[PDB]
């Protein structure tokens, strides 16, 4: 079978299941939603809210960016210098680790997700509490033996659409639904055995290194934000379509770093070469070949993406300041979580040329006002957003507080089993977390949220104590 | 004519003469040279020692750094504070001078150098003992009239290569020859009339101010070095390519200081604006535009460069210690002679951040071991180098002593008229140089003094006595 699907070459026939037409989101009260409120994403032809396209068409629209022409590669000298600097800092920072066993790699996986190709069964269905059995067991054992033998296997990714609350324009206007990459159990296990040590050692230094994957916002957040605030200028590029716009060369440099820092470099080399090769995405009908972009299905993909972001940012700064990357990196503090970034620096950065170099690389940096022009740099960290939270500071220190919209949203919607009508009320913890996140907004918003939770929990399950603002504020700030 | 020469824009055609293919250095005896000894720099296609590139190519190699991106400017508050501190110290220390006459400026110049553009004639060829006449006289008179009128003239610099003894690797390996900037007689005279008072007033205070230009090692050396030794820590950055790495903004601040302290500030403003504008360097084929770097042709440039050095040093220290610049300067002692420096301080200086800030400014500080990394700070002034001398101390005090290698070198090579084969023996019979060598050798002990005395006596029976060690030692130490 040959042809062209969504601008991307076709490799084989699709073994993926049909796209889900149900959502996990239930309403908390049968009342009408407030105007302008958020709703679960489009659910297909069975969605009774609107008459829209097929989910296949939305996935094709989301797959269009992966066919787009790439940007320019950074200068080779600058790129080499920045990769060497990053690798050397990680050498000085990372604690050497012992290789991961097959058992630990199997125990690291989430059993509440699909096994991917070819069985597409929920992992927990073949889990005994110790190891994998059955079909998934054979898959795991074959993957492990191929890992130990240093033999290549080609990964098969499965395309899906993300069930989440979206802006109403994304349902009643131009319908859009985010594309998710699922990975197969064999590739998951190979990547686990290969890069589990690296990811764990990187998590142990989530404070001393800009790759913040694994941090705790309530405990480790304030330290990270004080470290950032030690600096003069602050920025957040807020990229649009970060994963679709990536170049495989940057990910190859990042993966080379990850391999060189891994305890079993040859096996991780084989697994990374398999991961970064042209990927086979199963869109249901066909298996297509995606040559560029980020395959965001693997368990270690977040660390890899963050490293790529680090590389790109440092490259841009060396292109603007023309000083060596170590000079920038000793005069700067970075925070990277995939596509999310916070950059604090003391260097006088020409934001015009900085944005020009970023856009030259194929990236899509956006101002907050969504207008054209250079990126903005501020002299204070307050107001910047990271992990959907805003960075605030007071006499007690810095902290990250969840925005108000997300709190109201989680008050309106609760997660549950999959159903078809998102406005069905569920007749069946998170409320206390919402109370805590609202406490950081003042006593007014805390009183509002407290009234809402008190009225809610008296229509369902069991009663719940509604603490004073000061007590819950103390608990979430200083635990 | 347009284009790009050695990475630098082209402005016009070259009126400069061909590069010199002769050297002033003659051998002292027809004996075989010791292995690894130093020889005059590469002399072109006519050099019978090696077959190397054209001198034009060596000049291109030396002009390439001037096309390189500059470093970052220091923080504006730090730069302003240190410039104010330096200007105030010079105000409190320097004696006001009366403006210079045309005759004094004309008599300040060395008459044994080229007049530069447009005649490239030896100044002494048009010198009467009182003023300039002929072509050079008209050039001088026009320059003076433009000075008095406060009208701008653009300087025309002439590129050349420095005739000097270099290590053999710079002849038989990678050939390198230092770049010299010559200035035109008109700009020389204008700069003289403008900044002669400042340079003289700075010279009379060569002991109380770090700009050590004009000091006498035998007379003023011991005092300066004792003042240095009043301090705890001592360092010498030993910069590589000091002049190529300078930023015109620092030179502009230094020149603003020099103008504001001059008796005719409005005229000196015009002269400095002419000096620091993008310079027109005549490389023989073209006249190119060098926008950055240091134009090292004018008579006062040694002060200017040194002043720039001062600024940079203070900035780094103020960036490291974050104490007020006057606090640094009362807890420190500086010595600056262009690219040469000695820094003594009582402050606990983080050499990591000091070297980092220096390299951020575009400078290239180098360790003594020629390895990369931060600069070393020592607890003794012993070993530090200043004006090609080593700083030594004994029961009689501190002094600067020429190393043994340079003594042997000056015993092997003598200065004379320009010739093509550096191994020709000069038949012209040099008592002053020999006595200076005797004095410099006396400071190494009676053994080395006896060796040098044997060598000088053996080389003195072919030409034209040898005092007691203690007598010549007393003469050079305590005169």
How would you sum up the major sheet of chain A? 6 strands, mixed
Query: What oligomeric state do these chains adopt?
Result: part of a larger assembly
What is the percent of helical residues of chain A?
Answer: 25-40%
Supply the helix-strand structural class of chain A. alpha+beta
Overall form of chain A: globular
Please state the CA-atom Rg of chain A, rounded to the nearest Å.
23 Å
List the strand order in the largest sheet of chain A.
1-2-10-9-5-7
The DSSP helix count of chain A reads 16
Largest interface, Cβ cutoff 8 Å: A-B, 11 and 10 residues
Q: Please tell me the total number of domains of chain A.
A: 4
Number of strands of chain A: 16
Q: How much strand of chain A? A: 15-25%
First-to-last CA distance of chain A: 60 Å
Walk me through the topology.
The structure is cut from a larger assembly and holds 2 copies of chain A (479 residues).
Chain A: E1 4-5, E2 8-13, E3 23-27, E4 39-40, H1 55-63, H2 76-93, H3 102-107, H4 134-148, E5 156-161, E6 165-166, H5 169-172, E7 179-182, H6 185-204, H7 221-229, E8 233-235, H8 248-260, H9 265-276, E9 279-282, E10 286-290, H10 301-321, H11 325-330, E11 332-337, E12 340-345, H12 351-360, E13 385-386, E14 389-394, E15 397-402, H13 404-412, E16 413-419, H14 430-439, H15 443-457, H16 469-478
Parallel strand pairs in A: 5-9
Antiparallel strand pairs in A: 1-2, 2-10, 3-16, 4-6, 5-7, 8-12, 9-10, 11-12, 13-14, 14-15
Helix pairs in contact in A: 2-10, 4-6, 6-9, 8-9, 8-10, 10-12, 13-14, 14-15, 14-16
Cofactor (chain A): Mg(2+); Mn(2+)
Subunit structure (chain A): Homohexamer; also forms fibrous hexameric oligomer. Interacts with the viral genome-linked protein; this interaction induces the multimerization of the RdRp and enhances its activity.
Binding site for Mg(2+) (chain A): 236, 238, 340-341, 385
């Amino acid at each position: 079978p040959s042809g062209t699907y969504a601008g991307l070459p076709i490799a084989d026939y699709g073994d993926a299941p049909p796209l889900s037409t149900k959502t996990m989101f239930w309403r908390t009260s049968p009342e009408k939603l407030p105007p302008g409120a958020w709703e679960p994403a489009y659910l297909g032809s069975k969605d009774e809210r609107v008459d829209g396209p097929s989910l296949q068409q939305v996935m094709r629209d989301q797959l269009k960016p992966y066919s787009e022409p790439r940007g320019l590669l950074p200068p080779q000298e600058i790129l080499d210098a920045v990769c060497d600097a990053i690798e050397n800092r990680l050498e000085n920072t990372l604690e050497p680790q012992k290789p991961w066993t097959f058992k630990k790699a199997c125990e690291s996986l989430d059993k509440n997700t699909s096994s991917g190709y070819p069985y597409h069964k929920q992992k927990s269905k073949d889990w005994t509490g110790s190891a994998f059995i059955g079909d998934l067991g054979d898959q795991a054992t074959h993957a492990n033996n191929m890992y130990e033998m240093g033999k290549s296997m080609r990964p098969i990714y499965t395309a899906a659409l993300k069930d989440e609350l979206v802006k109403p324009d994304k349902i009643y206007g131009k319908i859009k639904k985010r594309l998710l990459w699922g990975s197969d159990l064999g590739t998951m296990i190979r990547a686990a055995r290969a890069f589990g040590p690296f990811c764990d050692a990187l998590k142990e230094t989530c404070i001393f290194n800009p790759i913040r994957v694994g941090m705790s916002m309530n405990e480790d957040g304030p330290f990270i934000f004080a470290r950032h605030a030690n600096f003069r200028y602050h920025m957040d590029a807020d990229y649009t379509r970060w994963d679709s716009t990536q170049q495989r060369a940057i990910l190859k440099r990042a993966g080379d770093i990850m391999v060189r820092l891994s305890p079993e470099p040859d096996l991780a080399r084989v697994v990374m070469d398999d991961l970064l090769a042209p990927s086979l995405l199963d869109v249901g009908d066909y298996k297509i070949v995606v040559e560029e972009g980020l395959p965001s299905g693997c368990p270690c993909t977040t660390q890899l993406n963050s490293l790529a972001h680090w590389i790109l940012t440092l490259c841009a700064m060396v292109e603007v300041t023309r000083v060596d990357p170590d000079i920038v990196m000793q005069e700067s503090e970075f925070s990277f979580y995939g596509d999310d970034e916070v950059v604090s620096t003391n260097l006088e950065l020409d934001m015009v040329k900085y944005t020009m170099a970023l856009r030259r690389y194929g990236l899509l940096p956006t101002r907050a006002d969504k207008e054209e022009g250079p990126l903005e740099r501020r002299q204070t960290l307050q107001g910047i957003s990271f992990l959907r939270r805003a960075i605030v500071g007071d006499q007690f220190g810095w902290y990250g507080r969840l925005d108000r919209a997300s709190i109201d949203r989680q008050l309106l919607w609760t997660k549950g089993p999959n159903h078809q009508n998102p406005f069905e009320t569920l007749p069946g913890s998170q409320l206390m977390a919402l109370l805590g996140e609202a406490a950081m907004h003042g006593e007014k918003y805390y009183r509002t949220v407290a009234s809402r939770v008190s009225k809610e929990a008296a229509q369902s399950g069991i009663e719940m104590v509604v603490p004073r603002h000061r007590s819950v504020l103390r608990w979430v700030r200083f635990g």
